Amino acid sequence: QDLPGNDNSTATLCLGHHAVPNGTLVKTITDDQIEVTNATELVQSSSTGKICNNPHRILDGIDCTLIDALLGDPHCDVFQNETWDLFVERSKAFSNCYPYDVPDYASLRSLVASSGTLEFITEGFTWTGVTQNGGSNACKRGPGSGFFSRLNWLTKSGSTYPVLNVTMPNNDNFDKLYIWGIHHPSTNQEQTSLYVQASGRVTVSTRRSQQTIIPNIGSRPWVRGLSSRISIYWTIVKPGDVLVINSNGNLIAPRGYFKMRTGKSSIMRSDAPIDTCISECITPNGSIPNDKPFQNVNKITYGACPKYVKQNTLKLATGMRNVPEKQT
Amino acid sequence: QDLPGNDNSTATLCLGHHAVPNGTLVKTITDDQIEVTNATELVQSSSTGKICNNPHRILDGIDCTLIDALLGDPHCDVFQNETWDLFVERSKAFSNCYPYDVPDYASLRSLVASSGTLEFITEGFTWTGVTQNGGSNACKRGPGSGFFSRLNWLTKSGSTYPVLNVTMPNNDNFDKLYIWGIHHPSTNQEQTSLYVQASGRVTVSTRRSQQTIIPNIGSRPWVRGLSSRISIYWTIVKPGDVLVINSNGNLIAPRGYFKMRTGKSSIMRSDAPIDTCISECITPNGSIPNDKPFQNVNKITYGACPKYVKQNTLKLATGMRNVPEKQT
Amino acid sequence: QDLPGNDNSTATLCLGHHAVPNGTLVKTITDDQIEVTNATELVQSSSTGKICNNPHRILDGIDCTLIDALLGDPHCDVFQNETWDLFVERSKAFSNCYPYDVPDYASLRSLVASSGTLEFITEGFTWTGVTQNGGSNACKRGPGSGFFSRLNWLTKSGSTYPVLNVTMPNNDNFDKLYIWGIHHPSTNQEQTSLYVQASGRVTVSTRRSQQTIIPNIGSRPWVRGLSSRISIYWTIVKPGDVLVINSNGNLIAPRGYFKMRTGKSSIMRSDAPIDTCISECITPNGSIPNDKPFQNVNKITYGACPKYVKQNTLKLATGMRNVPEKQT
Amino acid sequence: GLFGAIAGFIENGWEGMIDGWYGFRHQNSEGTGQAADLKSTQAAIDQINGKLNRVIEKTNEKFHQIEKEFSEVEGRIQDLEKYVEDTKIDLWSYNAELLVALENQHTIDLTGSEMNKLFEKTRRQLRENAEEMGNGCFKIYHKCDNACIESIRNGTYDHDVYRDEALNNRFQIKG
Amino acid sequence: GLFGAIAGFIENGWEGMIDGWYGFRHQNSEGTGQAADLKSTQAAIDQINGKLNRVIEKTNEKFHQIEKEFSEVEGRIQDLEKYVEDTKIDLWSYNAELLVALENQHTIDLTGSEMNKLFEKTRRQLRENAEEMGNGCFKIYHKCDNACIESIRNGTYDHDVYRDEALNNRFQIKG
Amino acid sequence: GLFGAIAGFIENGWEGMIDGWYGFRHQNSEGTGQAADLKSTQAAIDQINGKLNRVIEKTNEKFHQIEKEFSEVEGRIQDLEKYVEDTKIDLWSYNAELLVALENQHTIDLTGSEMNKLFEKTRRQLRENAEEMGNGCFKIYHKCDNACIESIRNGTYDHDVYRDEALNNRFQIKG
Numbered sequence A, B, C: 001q002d003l004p005g006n007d008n009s010t011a012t013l014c015l016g017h018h019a020v021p022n023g024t025l026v027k028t029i030t031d032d033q034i035e036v037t038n039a040t041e042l043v044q045s046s047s048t049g050k051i052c053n054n055p056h057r058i059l060d061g062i063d064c065t066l067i068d069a070l071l072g073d074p075h076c077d078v079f080q081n082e083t084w085d086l087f088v089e090r091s092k093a094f095s096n097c098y099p100y101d102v103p104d105y106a107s108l109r110s111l112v113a114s115s116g117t118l119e120f121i122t123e124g125f126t127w128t129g130v131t132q133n134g135g136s137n138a139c140k141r142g143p144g145s146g147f148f149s150r151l152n153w154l155t156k157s158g159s160t161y162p163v164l165n166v167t168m169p170n171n172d173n174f175d176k177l178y179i180w181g182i183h184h185p186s187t188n189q190e191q192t193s194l195y196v197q198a199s200g201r202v203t204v205s206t207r208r209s210q211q212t213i214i215p216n217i218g219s220r221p222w223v224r225g226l227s228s229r230i231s232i233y234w235t236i237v238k239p240g241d242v243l244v245i246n247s248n249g250n251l252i253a254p255r256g257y258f259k260m261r262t263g264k265s266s267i268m269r270s271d272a273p274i275d276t277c278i279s280e281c282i283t284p285n286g287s288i289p290n291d292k293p294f295q296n297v298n299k300i301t302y303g304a305c306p307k308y309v310k311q312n313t314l315k316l317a318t319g320m321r322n323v324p325e326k327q328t
Numbered sequence D, E, F: 001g002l003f004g005a006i007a008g009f010i011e012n013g014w015e016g017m018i019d020g021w022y023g024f025r026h027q028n029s030e031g032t033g034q035a036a037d038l039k040s041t042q043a044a045i046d047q048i049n050g051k052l053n054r055v056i057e058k059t060n061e062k063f064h065q066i067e068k069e070f071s072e073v074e075g076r077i078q079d080l081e082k083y084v085e086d087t088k089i090d091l092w093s094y095n096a097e098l099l100v101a102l103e104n105q106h107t108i109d110l111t112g113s114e115m116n117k118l119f120e121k122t123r124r125q126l127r128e129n130a131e132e133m134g135n136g137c138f139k140i141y142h143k144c145d146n147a148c149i150e151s152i153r154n155g156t157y158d159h160d161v162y163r164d165e166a167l168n169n170r171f172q173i174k175g
């Protein structure tokens, strides 16, 4: 095309790719240590060590267990009508009120903890023919004897205890959770002294269910001067239903109902300090950043968190093979 | 080879691939919207809205619950000795017979529902010294009072309720499921009136097990004029074993046994209409076609169904990249 | 460079790859039978049929169930204070001692089986005012009548079964598991004869819990001449806690405690013969080699085993495509 | 695409090729015209059907399972029932999403492979008689009428037949 | 690497190329010099970002789950609670491990593909005027000054412009 | 295969090559001969061993799990126990099946890659002295005795040594 050139020479072009002096090792299908130019870590492996108090409502239980907050141990009256997204239960929580036990504590703690509210409505129960407001010197309301704020201990008026037979409709729009209980005396003399009859009986029923618990007289170990226990029970009454509480003795009566909610609330045991900062993923070790897809901090989590994995490191290559000419 | 020519010219060949004007978007490892020539949908996402009555045996419960069909609520006598692959429980099911409760209703409904049969064999139980066939005006057999067809309510004869002690061997080839119960009176006067003793007791035993239930006298809420309940219990008696029913009061006796089967039967709550058509996958929303590998209609399913997935669409590219002649 | 050669000729080089006459078929993403030069089987599908007694401690239960070894059925006194990694329960296991039942047998067998030890410490319980060491002609200790080695059947002194009220602290470093029980008489005359009162009662409590069981008088089926049963219960007492056993009748008292451990022990039902050989993976079908990643021998396993899969064969191609020229 | 033919050196597709997935277009001394290649079109199709059949196979039947909808608040056991199913659903959703992604990625490379294989094949056939103009077209350096184009397309093209003609006016260094 | 360019015919990388991932070096008629190619460097980068964004997306929120730490020995139900979570953890661990392996494998082939594509592209452009020395360098058989090198690199190189010159001293069978 | 060499341009395999996976046959001035290539044979083997070792590693020990066989009909809790295990087994079965499929697919492309890489490598070495006859054989256009064939095979072939000879009787447009 162009005219015969008076010169003659060639040129050389070489293609190639960069390489870095340092370079990270990564796993592959066929090798488990191959060095690439660059990688990114896919496993979150460390907590800040603090539960960020934002954006979830974190209620610190301080030295109360959620069940004591519910029953209303004097030292937990702080929590009345409280609300949470995550209730944090501290290892140092204690109780000091009448010795109780909750047969299936596990489910009561669960269903209270998901409801997320401790909102109490007092109802006009009328106990005809018994003495109300009994308390104990093991559960002190300040100077005096006392009891759980939400429970009502009924004993003999004058020298009898009648067959209590009360009712409380759920004419409301929502489910109502009633917590009640039965007192187990330690001696037969204690049984008759308080409730007159030799054997109490509590039957709590709705149209849908019934439960009859009979007390058990006997000595248990000394807890706060007492050898007696009360066992805790719960009844949910659906809208339109009726609660009928019938007893001839040993009843620990409900003073009304807790409202049930359906939300995203939970409870978590942790001694991690709550701090002001915003983090959506909470583990009992404190909050962790959900930038990475997987995490290895803890298998217990609340909120938008990375998926727990056994691996503490998983590198994703974000660059080609590193084939250096020199080294550094 | 051949000879020098007079004409001289070249030619041009070009390779290429088709492209479509329309074209579907699809996800990849490296992009999440790349346009291909063609895709196919892997998520089944819609029901016909009808439970096809073929090929599975679908028994519509109409207004009976499977447990009422079992106990034999008068309004469900239709189901006696019925059989199913899938029992469909309707939201509109009701019961109108003596108020009962089944402690662990959940397991009784399960094990009846997998057995798949309600075949009843009446056995010659002989209740010596008590009145049989008691019924209630809350459970009407037509004009009169009545009871569950498969249960036998025993009351005193004149002045006495004896300690019943009967036995019924399983000399048969199969396991026998016996449904029995205990009556809880609402008043003490009711207890003594019916069963003479102040406290009934029912112990049902085999060589392998025993259960003793004691009744609970007290007022429950009014259900069909009654403040009493009966609680339902079940005993499976293995081949070669013996059933011994012993009671001094409050027994609701079995009239024989249900046969147990081992099959592919289940129960499903659904208000979807049953219709004549053939579909192997059933969800409570109606049947769905199992051509696709995954589905998003419902997580509850019976039969050969696609795997439930959260995704409501997952497109599998079934063609190359679409690179059209002109993008706009 | 070199000088002109008279000859003028070319050469031919051909590249290619080996092929084998035989060749295995394998699945791919796009085909499910493609023939490769060589494959390796990834599913372990056969047992040796023998449980290798190494390296795990395998205790053969011979004709004892772990619960009978625990309670101490005479015919199982062999197992006292034994220890295992895997307890093997044989189909031919039987029991011949007083008829008992364990409400939630399932959890007692589990927690004993993971503890891995049957180490018994006798404690100085002092039963004041009752007769000890009662036995039965259905549970023979050699020529004579006897009972479970670890249980103590108490009956009255003279005309008195006092209210037993004993205590036993856990001043130790570890959790203690106490097994106790209650006797259910078959006749009322039997109840009063043995325990004087018309109704026994057993309450076993710690600071953390209580359980009160009341017996149930009635006829059960004849098992070894007896119509009575004893029901078995367990109480774990944490370090620092106290056990209080209180009863006025029908107590089957603990003679001390079992030590609880936390290890890798389990129990497995199998009739596979134990043999001397070393294999880390055990299934009830015998041991299997854990060279392959997956297995299809049994879903029940103990030790380092391949993952159970439904597939009985999964071939991993370990060679190229086989494209033969002859055929074979 | 790993091979760089589709959306690569072959700039774009032909909306006009309604009779196959891959094919040929030519301009020669007699006219122009197009024709789809059926062998690579089948190769692409059968692989896509193969994977499609494997993913469309094996529905597992399930009958009595666990209950998955509750209407009363129970606590611990119901909590577990809901956890078992929720973790099951999340694991299967992960599987369906990774499966179609992995698959789609592979289908684009597989169809792309077939393009480039047709090209390389046509390249080898033409031996010294054509030059790649790098846009997916070959310049054939000799008179190639419609039957010649039919023989390149049906794989019977004898390159020797035109080697001298081509070679001469290919390397006629005279301009 | 499937394509055999990186760690293959291109012996090693250049620690010196600090301005791109792939590029050119040239010995030429007015000095030796290097320059990174930005089009293949972006292609490599965007695919890696794409996969990276897909794996970094979608954290599932979970609120009230099952309890995963117990402090009392319960037996059967607690045994099941521990089994559900342990099997969940093992399944997700298998998934994270296979995912990064599968991915890493693919990233090495993808970046390797881009290398080989730049090479093939440069090859096609140079048409009959260069020969591959098989080490990732082309010998350009004609006088190619810095602007010529710039036009090969920016894809405007007209091969015809140097065809005669090249072709002549490429096939000068005279030695 | 993505690259189209095995079961592609290399029509079939050699049952006779008992000493390697890939190799050379030749027919030169002193007769015919075959010889396996050990470098590509190791490359293919080591990758296959690598993946094989990764899939053959890590058995998880499990000790006390949940009971998986029942002998009495219990209802709700037993229903859940069977569901947890059945869903576990189906998830792991899906994993084993997708794993060997994914793998097998990749092993066929990996061994195919090595074939094509050996080819391309031999191609580059021969520079202007050979033509591909497109069936996996190169026609070497100069007198190449057994030592010449040995040097192509051991990568020391100097193409310049035969460039003039080859080039001349390669392009002798005279027929």
Ligand SMILES: *[C@@H]1O[C@H](CO)[C@@H](O[C@@H]2O[C@H](CO)[C@@H](O[C@@H]3O[C@H](CO)[C@@H](O)[C@H](O)[C@@H]3O)[C@H](O)[C@H]2NC(C)=O)[C@H](O)[C@H]1NC(C)=O
Binding pocket: A187, A219, A220, A221, A222, A227, C165, C166, C167, C242, C244
């Ligand atoms: C049944 O047996 C139990 C245990 O043998 C008896 O419980 C013990 O009762 C005594 C007397 O009340 C308790 O004593 C008090 O203990 C506190 C704390 O150490 C101390 O400060 C007091 O000054 C007094 O000593 C003792 O703690 C308690 N022990 C246990 C383990 O609970 C019970 O009294 C017996 N019941 C009957 C009716 O016989």
Ligand SMILES: *[C@@H]1O[C@H](CO)[C@@H](O[C@@H]2O[C@H](CO)[C@@H](O[C@@H]3O[C@H](CO)[C@@H](O)[C@H](O)[C@@H]3O)[C@H](O)[C@H]2NC(C)=O)[C@H](O)[C@H]1NC(C)=O
Binding pocket: A165, A166, A167, A242, A244, B187, B219, B220, B221, B222, B223, B227
């Ligand atoms: C214990 O307390 C409960 C609730 O306070 C009492 O239940 C109520 O009993 C009355 C009288 O039987 C029931 O009245 C009946 O209502 C139906 C429908 O209106 C009607 O057919 C009857 O003529 C009569 O009016 C009432 O429904 C029932 N209420 C509930 C919520 O169950 C029970 O009587 C008390 N028991 C004792 C022994 O005091």
Ligand SMILES: *[C@@H]1O[C@H](CO)[C@@H](O[C@@H]2O[C@H](CO)[C@@H](O[C@@H]3O[C@H](CO)[C@@H](O)[C@H](O)[C@@H]3O)[C@H](O)[C@H]2NC(C)=O)[C@H](O)[C@H]1NC(C)=O
Binding pocket: B165, B166, B167, B242, B244, C187, C219, C220, C221, C222
């Ligand atoms: C309540 O009813 C049950 C069953 O009807 C009665 O049980 C039966 O009692 C008899 C007499 O003890 C048992 O007979 C024995 O059989 C063995 C074995 O053959 C034999 O060696 C003894 O000498 C004796 O004859 C019979 O096995 C037993 N049957 C069952 C199924 O347990 C029970 O006696 C009744 N109880 C009362 C208080 O009426």
Ligand SMILES: CC(=O)N[C@H]1[C@H]([C@H](O)[C@H](O)CO)O[C@@](O)(C(=O)O)C[C@@H]1O
Binding pocket: A134, A135, A136, A137, A138, A145, A153, A155, A185, A186, A190, A194, A226, A227, A228
């Ligand atoms: C209702 C009632 O009478 N409560 C009394 C109780 C009960 O007798 C015991 O708690 C039974 O265990 O005993 C006290 O000594 C106590 O310290 O609590 C005083 C208290 O007034």
Ligand SMILES: CC(=O)N[C@H]1[C@H]([C@H](O)[C@H](O)CO)O[C@@](O)(C(=O)O)C[C@@H]1O
Binding pocket: B134, B135, B136, B137, B138, B145, B153, B155, B185, B186, B190, B194, B226, B227, B228
């Ligand atoms: C066996 C028996 O005597 N049944 C009678 C019952 C029971 O007394 C109550 O159901 C106890 O709650 O009461 C009736 O009024 C009823 O309407 O059912 C009449 C019936 O004959």
Ligand SMILES: CC(=O)N[C@H]1[C@H]([C@H](O)[C@H](O)CO)O[C@@](O)(C(=O)O)C[C@@H]1O
Binding pocket: C134, C135, C136, C137, C138, C145, C153, C155, C185, C186, C190, C194, C226, C227, C228
């Ligand atoms: C403590 C005691 O008195 N045990 C006696 C028992 C019980 O009376 C029954 O087991 C109650 O069911 O009866 C025997 O006949 C027996 O064979 O075991 C003798 C034995 O000495």
Ligand SMILES: *[C@@H]1O[C@H](CO)[C@@H](O)[C@H](O)[C@H]1NC(C)=O
Binding pocket: A080, A081, A119, A120, A121
């Ligand atoms: C709790 O909230 C309810 C809301 O209606 C209120 O009536 C009740 O008195 C409150 N009690 C306390 C202690 O805040």
Ligand SMILES: *[C@@H]1O[C@H](CO)[C@@H](O)[C@H](O)[C@H]1NC(C)=O
Binding pocket: A045, A046, A047, A284, A285, A296, A297, A298
């Ligand atoms: C998180 O806390 C657990 C115990 O709650 C501990 O075992 C674990 O190692 C901790 N992990 C990190 C990353 O802090």
Ligand SMILES: *[C@@H]1O[C@H](CO)[C@@H](O)[C@H](O)[C@H]1NC(C)=O
Binding pocket: A038, A039, A040, A318, E052
């Ligand atoms: C490594 O990759 C990550 C993600 O692509 C990126 O943020 C990081 O900067 C990369 N490293 C370098 C040196 O670019």
Ligand SMILES: *[C@@H]1O[C@H](CO)[C@@H](O)[C@H](O)[C@H]1NC(C)=O
Binding pocket: B080, B081, B119, B120, B121
């Ligand atoms: C139910 O089936 C059994 C089968 O033997 C029969 O004896 C029984 O009488 C049947 N009863 C009814 C109501 O169909």
Ligand SMILES: *[C@@H]1O[C@H](CO)[C@@H](O)[C@H](O)[C@H]1NC(C)=O
Binding pocket: B045, B046, B047, B284, B285, B296, B297, B298
């Ligand atoms: C199926 O029914 C459920 C409730 O049973 C409903 O929430 C869901 O959206 C329905 N899905 C379809 C596709 O009908």
Ligand SMILES: *[C@@H]1O[C@H](CO)[C@@H](O)[C@H](O)[C@H]1NC(C)=O
Binding pocket: B038, B039, B040, B318, D052
């Ligand atoms: C898209 O792919 C599916 C499955 O391969 C097929 O049935 C459908 O017809 C394809 N679309 C077209 C236009 O061919």
Ligand SMILES: *[C@@H]1O[C@H](CO)[C@@H](O)[C@H](O)[C@H]1NC(C)=O
Binding pocket: C080, C081, C119, C120, C121
């Ligand atoms: C069981 O072991 C303990 C260990 O202290 C010992 O005291 C006890 O006597 C042993 N009993 C038997 C029967 O071996």
Ligand SMILES: *[C@@H]1O[C@H](CO)[C@@H](O)[C@H](O)[C@H]1NC(C)=O
Binding pocket: C045, C046, C047, C284, C285, C296, C297, C298
């Ligand atoms: C293992 O044993 C089970 C029953 O325990 C049996 O069904 C299964 O087929 C056996 N498998 C092998 C490989 O022995």
Ligand SMILES: *[C@@H]1O[C@H](CO)[C@@H](O)[C@H](O)[C@H]1NC(C)=O
Binding pocket: C038, C039, C040, C318, F052
């Ligand atoms: C097939 O592959 C396995 C694993 O790589 C190997 O042990 C076996 O020897 C191979 N077969 C042949 C004939 O080499």
Ligand SMILES: *[C@@H]1O[C@H](CO)[C@@H](O)[C@H](O)[C@H]1NC(C)=O
Binding pocket: D147, D148, D150, D151, D154, D156
């Ligand atoms: C290929 O095309 C040429 C020209 O039409 C024809 O002669 C030849 O027979 C064809 N061969 C085949 C196999 O179609």
